[PDB]
Design a protein around this ligand. Structure first.
Ligand SMILES: [Zn+2]
Length: 265
């Protein structure tokens, strides 16, 4: 298989991670998706200790606890699995950690979770943090740099990606350290559109295209995949892969990215 890196986000609240492994290319048998993203664990805030911390809702916890059936099989077949981390309406977000030490403690929780569950990486989605709730501060310009630097240091050989949205995504440089190069990938969060991420990464690691499989018209899915290849971009994002038969939708972009339509087990 040769072509852009395919990524699929799965809202584990309602869907199975395994669905991502169901699609392969008719010509070649390669995976239609190269990366699967568990959406989403989150950044919580303890008002008492005034400390942010990593939280997994029951659904996220359930899939992590069942890594052998929910995650391991995807990895066995060559698909990378990442844990997305999202804001949780509690004031704490990736852009408002008060210090280097504070950001670093949270990065350890992340890297520890990655090792414990045998994950391939982390995805940062700075949305719904609601900076300010519970007496918290507004995003500052060192928090994210500190968090990314620590995480990357913690897991040098794993994946770290950026869902391109929010205060954090605009605060990649501080004190002479630009954290753009510590990210493996970055992508557009707006389904049905082409929006090149601002983060200073080369085309090969960016996905200006974004589609919500089953919702975006197969014409637009095909168009964005076509533009991806034509403009030389190296990633393509599919959001909300569900349990329905989306072979036609997956084929809409695989024909363009890989030259083969897809098959679903
Ligand atoms: Zn809210």
């Amino acid at each position: 298989k040769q072509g852009p890196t395919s990524v699929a986000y799965v809202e584990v609240n309602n869907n199975s991670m395994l669905n991502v492994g169901k699609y392969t290319l008719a010509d070649g048998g390669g995976n239609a998706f190269d990366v699967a993203v568990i959406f989403a664990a989150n950044i919580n805030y303890d008002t008492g200790t005034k400390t942010a911390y990593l939280h997994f809702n029951e659904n996220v916890q359930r899939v992590l606890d069942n890594a052998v059936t929910q995650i391991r099989p995807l990895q066995q077949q060559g698909i990378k699995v990442l844990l997305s981390v999202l804001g949780n309406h509690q004031g704490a977000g990736f852009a408002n950690f008060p210090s280097q030490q504070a950001a670093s403690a949270f990065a350890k929780q992340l890297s520890d979770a990655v090792a414990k569950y045998g994950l391939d990486g982390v995805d940062f989605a700075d949305e719904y943090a609601e900076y300010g709730n519970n007496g918290t501060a507004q995003p500052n310009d060192s928090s994210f740099v500190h968090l990314v630097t620590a995480l990357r240091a913690n897991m040098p050989d794993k994946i770290i990606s950026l869902y391109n949205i929010g205060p954090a995504a605009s605060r990649l440089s501080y004190g002479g350290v630009d954290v753009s190069d510590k990210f493996d990938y970055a992508w557009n969060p707006y389904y049905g559109t082409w929006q090149v991420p601002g983060i200073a990464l080369p085309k090969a690691q960016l996905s200006p295209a974004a589609v919500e499989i089953g919702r975006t018209s197969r014409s637009t899915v095909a168009d964005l995949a076509r533009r991806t290849v034509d403009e030389g971009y190296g990633v393509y994002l599919t959001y909300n892969l569900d349990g329905g038969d989306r072979t036609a939708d997956v084929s809409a972009f695989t024909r363009e990215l890989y030259g083969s339509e897809a098959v679903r087990t």
